[PDB]
């Protein structure tokens, strides 16, 4: 279906409010996560298929944010996101987060960028993801 | 995208698919239809209204035709004869003709139908009036069989009802066109049938016996995935379902 | 081009001659009768005739054509005026339509009329006679349409008069048509 | 590449309408200039002789009393201001429209 | 290059090689193992985090290029607590009313509304078949082990348009969606299909209803075709099958009828790896001659530990889309085995009866014919869908 009821509003308000913070630590982004408890999402009488199907397009709608051309903080809040997002559903299995053959290459270079950065958070975050094998090898997200 | 629904090929210029293949060919010879024969839509009041006017017009036209070719016949031999008594013998046909076109446009419209299965002409109906979509038969079977104006379309009696109940058993439910005759109401097989069935016991089921209760098992343990089941497709093996 | 299949006219298309040049004579022969022949271009009248003829030998395989759709088939440019002798004929056709009873009944108009002219073509010469206002030996006006538009008023007895012509000429309206020597000079630096 | 090619009257073609601003140019210029339509062909570029001939053709049906009026009521005349009076006016019609 | 990207945002794909694809995934994935069927370690709050330290902390400082403190430190700053706004047990069937979301205040406003005897209920969210492929497939494995996938397989979703279009709907399609895999061919796939049109039946029976015909159309005809990027592929592996793509070519190449030149391969020369195609575009597939099948390529991947590993389900149906049953004319409850033409007895031509309804009123207490009509017996697609 696409983009999700009322998620896109509250996605970049959280990523428009984490940049405002000129910070990149992944502490103020959970901080702000837990304030207005963004990890309760995945409640409110979702039965397995509408559970699954949101996660699904969550992790998706996350995405565009995780990708350019959004530079290196907006990029890291969205990387705390997708972080959030796929750690706090409720899904068996975990549902996973979909990468386009365009996007992988440019995402590990990324992973190689948040290494260079000395900013050490999101790049723990994003190979942590890896090992929980979040991202998923998909023609198109 | 969605251009390239069925037909998948369809020619620019004229809009034809490819032509009749050998199976297809076959299953034509053989008899076996093809699912978009399964195609049929409803009845629309203006339908009816159209299709009446169309059997009025038919039946005004069945008239009236053979009697203005006497009329014009009569007239070109008027204009060429000198004898003045044939003459007037040929203008008093003229005059009978002339009469009987103001009475029969006076007719009203029940007695230019006239009766259930006189003659009318289905096809040029069909392709002319109809323009084709509706077949001649089609019409034929809905204006001779519901809709014209002789059968019976009232609703069901209770005695009606009882006695079609019990006279459905005389003839073993089955027969049904005895059993309307019978019911003396003019109804029609079909519609003793129809209303014997959306009542009959036998049929509609508040009860279970063995063998549904086997193929329903069967087909849920073939079919179902985990809390899905056709439930209402399930119909078709067992009977007297919904 | 209608006479045989071809990849640009499938069989819905295709039509036997005799029966089209047969029904466009039963019309033309109108069209002369009916003063739409006289003082017009010939040929307008030959391409509305076939237009319809072709359509009305198969309406519910033709009624959806066009003019251009109907003469790009046959590679056939199309007269403008076509149009005006279609209005004119169909116009024509519903008032022979309306003779009939048995045709009355049916409500016609412009789009059903079509599919009907073989039905009034074997009466068109009772329709006429029937339909006409004009009786007289030498209720629809049988007129040429450049006064089926009627006159304003039927041509009063013209003021056919003669004047004066020998009375002195005011000389102040010969002045008015003069250049003051002002405008002589405004015109002489325009130029 | 037919025989059926179409032969009509092709000599009415589209020419241009007439604007009602310009109609009170061209009466201005009765009052302004005078009849000579080759001299007010030059006025209006946009228009030649024979439009002039065909517009006083046209208003001559009805007006003539207009072409009297305004032929008595006499200005001074000056090409350069009427071609500024001309586009400003024209101007001023399209910016209210 | 095989390189993917939209032709239409969101509608279609440009064309790529798939087995040249799925090597271009495979050369960024292979030997790093985010690919493999295996099941890896993953997170947890940090108060647990002992025992896999020793295997994290060591593989966390090599790919960082970081000390082991450094990845300790690393573990323990993103361990869930920080994250868990809800409790391990908390249930989803309720909304949590410690939460700012504007996300869950819609969904308040969504099922505050049901909550009334007229509306209280746990019925279907919009749609019902999709997590029942899930659940019954989803992580599983074969009990043969000829039937498992192998590592870094290409998973391909095809969506099998129902030749019976809505034709009032356009937007949304009838379909049912079908996975396969990129080694497999397309003889697996047409093999799959369990479409009714292979048991179309007919013949005129209204003298002898019970001489029905005892070959379905499966039987009698065995034809079927792929059509991707201008090459048919017809089966045949069997006499019943005749290659269809002669004649479709031989009329279609005779004019200007606004199609490309084609050409002809069979079914079984090309695995789904051979192909160069485009995501979400219009493909063709028939077969009984007649059943043309729209074949849209909706997704392609490779396969990973979750999914569904035991092939002896696939080709794995998806999706589906629910087509309604034709009900009899005369008790309009119960779905028609028969259909007649010319029926003196029907209201209208034609007119669908149930078996038991068509008996009775067409036949006597011994089968003979009643009336005047023509009777064809009736497997129905909105049954057998
Ligand atoms: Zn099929
Ligand atoms: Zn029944």
Redesign the pocket.
Known sequence: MGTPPGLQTDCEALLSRFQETDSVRFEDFTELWRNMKFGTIFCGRMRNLEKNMFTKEALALAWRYFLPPYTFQIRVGALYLLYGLYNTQLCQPKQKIRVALKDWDEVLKFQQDLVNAQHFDAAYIFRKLRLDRAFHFTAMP | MGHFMKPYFKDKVTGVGPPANEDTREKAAQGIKAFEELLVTKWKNWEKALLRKSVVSDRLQRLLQPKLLKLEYLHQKQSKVSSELERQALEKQGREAEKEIQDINQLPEEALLGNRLDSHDWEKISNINFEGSRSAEEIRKFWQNSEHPSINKQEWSREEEERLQAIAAAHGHLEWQKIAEELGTSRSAFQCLQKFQQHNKALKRKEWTEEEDRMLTQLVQEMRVGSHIPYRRIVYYMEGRD | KLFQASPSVPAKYVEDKEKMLSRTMQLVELANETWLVTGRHPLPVITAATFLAWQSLQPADRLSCSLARFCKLANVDLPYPASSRLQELLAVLLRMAEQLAWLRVLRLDKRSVVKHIGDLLQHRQSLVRSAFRDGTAEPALLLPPCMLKSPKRICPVPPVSTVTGDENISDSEIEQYLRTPQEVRDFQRAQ | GSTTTYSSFRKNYYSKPWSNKETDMFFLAISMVGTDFSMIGQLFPHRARIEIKNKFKREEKTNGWRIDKAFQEKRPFDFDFFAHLLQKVLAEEEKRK | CNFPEYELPELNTRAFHVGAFGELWRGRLRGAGDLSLREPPASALPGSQAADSDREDAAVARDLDCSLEAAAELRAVCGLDKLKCLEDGEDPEVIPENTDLVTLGVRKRFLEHREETITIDRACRQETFVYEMESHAIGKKPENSADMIEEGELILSVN?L??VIFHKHKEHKPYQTMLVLGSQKLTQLRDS?R????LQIGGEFSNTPDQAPEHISKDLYKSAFFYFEGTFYNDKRYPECRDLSRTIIEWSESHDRGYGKFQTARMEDFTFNDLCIKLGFPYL????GD???VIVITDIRLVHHDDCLDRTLYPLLIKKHWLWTRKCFVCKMYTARWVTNNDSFAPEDPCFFCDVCFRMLHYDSEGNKLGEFLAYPYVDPGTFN
Do not use: A
């Open positions: 099998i129902y030749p299909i479409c009714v049109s292979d597939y028939c077969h009984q059943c043309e099948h």
